[PDB]
Design a protein around this ligand. Structure first.
Ligand SMILES: Nc1ncnc2c1ncn2[C@H]1C[C@H](O)[C@@H](COP(=O)(O)OP(=O)(O)OP(=O)(O)O)O1
Ligand SMILES: [Ca+2]
Ligand code: NA
Length: 430
DNA sequence: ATTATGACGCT
DNA sequence: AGCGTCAT
C-alpha cells in the first residue's frame, strides 16, 4: 500500500559507446568510416580474432569471436583494423586512452562509475533536481529529446522508425505532470534531457557516438541502453516494467546471464523475468540464497538498490597472454622471457598511472594456466610489489610459480603453460 | 586456437 | 588468501 517502496528515488543512466574499438579506428582512419569493418587481434591464425564489429558489418552476420577468415565468407568486402602489437603481444593502450577521453567528459555532468572500458553509470538525481528548479513548472518540449525512445510507447487507439519514436515521445510528454517536482516520471524525463546533452558533448568533443539508458537503477538503465542501439537513448519508467518483463528472458538481465540464471529457469520452471513475481521472498532465498533471493524479489518488480559507485579509475592494472595448443611454453627460458615481456608492459602502464593518478600499487598477483585444465586460471599467487621495475617483477613472478614445474629436468617446463597473467593491485595514495 | 582484460562474491 | 562467476 502506502508504505510499499517502489524504487523510484533515484535517476540513473548507463552510457555505452557504440561498437567502441571500431569507432576509435574509424576516427583515426576516415577510409573506414561508414563501412562494414571490424577490429581484429593477431593475423596469423585464421586472419585474426574479431573483437569489435561495425553496425554495417553486423547486417551481414559478422560477430565478435568470429575468425576474420570466416567473417570474410559472410562479408567479402569487410574492412579490418588490427590491434597494435608490442613486446610480442596485443596492446590495448589506444582504446584505454580513448576511454579516458570519454570518461572525463561524462565526469563534468555528474559522479560516474566506470563499468568497463567503454561504459559508465551516472547518478543524475541531484542534477535533475537542479534542472527542475531552473525550468520552474515550464513544460518539456520534444525538441529537447531528439534521440529518445520511451519504452512501451506508443500504445492504444506511420510505418517508419522515426515516426514511431516521435509518436511515443508525444504520448509520453502529453501525459506528464510538470507541476509536481517529485513525480518520478518527470524526474526520469529531465534525466533524459541531461543525457541528450551529455551524449551531444561526447560526440562533439571526441567524434564518438553512443547509446544510453535512463531509469531508476543500474540494472534497468543497462537493459534500457540496449533496446535501441546505435546512437539512441531509451527511457524505461517504473510503469513500463510489468509489460517489458512479461516477455523478457531471464538471461538478459545483468548478472543472470550465466549459471545462476540457468538455475532460476530450471528450478522454478519459468522463462521470463516477470514470472518471478509469483514467488515469495523466502521462496526465492531458499533456492538461490539470502542475497540473491532478496535481489531477485525486488528486481522482478523493477527495484534494485545498488549504488552508482564514485569510481572513474580501474582498481587493478593487468597484463595477460594465452599460449594455445602448440605454442604452449615448455622451457624455463621461454617462461622467463614472456614474464619479462608482460612485466615490461605492466611497468610502463604503472608508471603512467602513478604520474596521472597519484597512486601506487602494492601487490603483484601472478596467475598461470597449465595444459589440460578446463578452467581459465589454474593457479594464482600474490607477492609484494615494492618497486616499479620489470626485471624485479618478472623475477618475483617466476619465484612464486617456479615450483609448479612438474619436470624433473631443471630446464624443461611441464606441464607446458598455456596462459600467463600479471596483475598490479591494492593501490595506495602517493 | 577467442583473447585481453576487469569487478566482485565465497569460504 | 586463492578460487569462481559474470561481464565487456
Ligand atoms: N570478449 C571480448 N574480448 C575482447 N574485447 C572485448 C570483448 N568484449 C568487448 N570487448 C571490447 C571491444 C568492444 O568494442 C569494447 C566494448 O564492448 P561492448 O560494449 O560489449 O561492445 P561494442 O561497444 O563493440 O558494441 P555495442 O555497440 O554493441 O556496445 O570492449
Ligand atoms: Ca559498447
Ligand atoms: Na560496453
Amino acid at each position: 500500500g502506502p508504505h510499499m517502496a517502489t524504487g523510484q528515488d533515484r535517476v540513473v543512466a548507463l552510457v555505452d559507446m557504440d561498437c567502441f574499438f571500431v569507432q576509435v579506428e574509424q576516427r583515426q582512419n576516415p577510409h573506414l568510416r561508414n563501412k562494414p569493418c571490424a577490429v581484429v587481434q593477431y593475423k596469423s591464425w585464421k586472419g585474426g580474432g574479431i573483437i569489435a564489429v561495425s553496425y554495417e558489418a553486423r547486417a551481414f552476420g559478422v560477430t565478435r569471436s568470429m575468425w576474420a577468415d570466416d567473417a570474410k565468407k559472410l562479408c567479402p568486402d569487410l574492412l579490418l583494423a588490427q590491434v597494435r602489437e608490442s613486446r610480442g603481444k596485443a596492446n590495448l593502450t589506444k582504446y584505454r586512452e580513448a576511454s579516458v577521453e570519454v570518461m572525463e567528459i561524462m565526469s563534468r555532468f555528474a559522479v560516474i562509475e566506470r563499468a568497463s572500458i567503454d561504459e559508465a553509470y551516472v547518478d543524475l538525481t541531484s542534477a535533475v533536481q537542479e534542472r527542475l528548479q531552473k525550468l520552474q513548472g515550464q513544460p518539456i518540449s520534444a525538441d529537447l529529446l531528439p534521440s529518445t525512445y520511451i519504452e512501451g510507447l506508443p500504445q492504444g487507439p506511420t510505418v517508419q522508425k522515426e515516426g514511431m519514436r516521435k509518436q511515443g515521445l508525444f504520448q509520453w510528454l502529453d501525459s506528464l505532470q510538470i507541476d509536481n517536482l517529485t513525480s518520478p516520471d518527470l524526474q526520469l524525463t529531465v534525466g533524459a534531457v541531461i543525457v541528450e546533452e551529455m551524449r551531444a558533448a561526447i560526440e562533439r568533443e571526441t567524434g564518438f557516438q553512443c547509446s544510453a539508458g535512463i531509469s531508476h537503477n543500474k540494472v534497468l538503465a543497462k537493459l534500457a541502453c540496449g533496446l535501441n542501439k546505435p546512437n539512441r537513448q531509451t527511457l524505461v519508467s517504473h510503469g513500463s516494467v510489468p509489460q517489458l518483463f512479461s516477455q523478457m528472458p531471464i538471461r538478459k538481465i545483468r548478472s543472470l546471464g550465466g549459471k545462476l540464471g540457468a538455475s532460476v529457469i530450471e528450478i522454478l520452471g519459468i522463462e521470463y523475468m516477470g514470472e518471478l513475481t509469483q514467488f515469495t521472498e523466502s521462496q526465492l532465498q531458499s533456492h538461490f540464497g539470502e542475497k540473491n533471493g532478496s535481489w531477485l524479489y525486488a528486481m522482478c518488480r523493477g527495484i534494485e538498490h545498488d549504488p552508482v559507485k564514485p569510481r572513474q579509475l580501474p582498481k587493478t592494472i593487468g597484463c595477460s597472454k594465452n599460449f594455445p595448443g602448440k605454442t604452449a611454453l615448455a622451457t624455463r627460458e621461454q617462461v622467463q622471457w614472456w614474464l619479462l615481456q608482460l612485466a615490461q608492459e605492466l611497468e610502463e602502464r604503472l608508471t603512467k598511472d602513478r604520474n596521472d593518478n597519484d597512486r601506487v600499487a602494492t601487490q603483484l598477483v601472478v596467475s598461470i594456466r597449465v595444459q589440460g585444465d578446463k578452467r581459465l586460471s589454474s593457479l594464482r599467487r600474490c607477492c609484494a610489489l615494492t618497486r616499479y621495475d620489470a626485471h624485479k617483477m618478472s623475477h618475483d613472478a617466476f619465484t612464486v610459480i617456479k615450483n609448479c614445474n612438474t619436470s624433473g629436468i631443471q630446464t624443461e617446463w611441464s606441464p607446458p603453460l598455456t596462459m600467463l597473467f600479471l596483475c598490479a593491485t591494492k593501490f595506495s595514495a602517493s
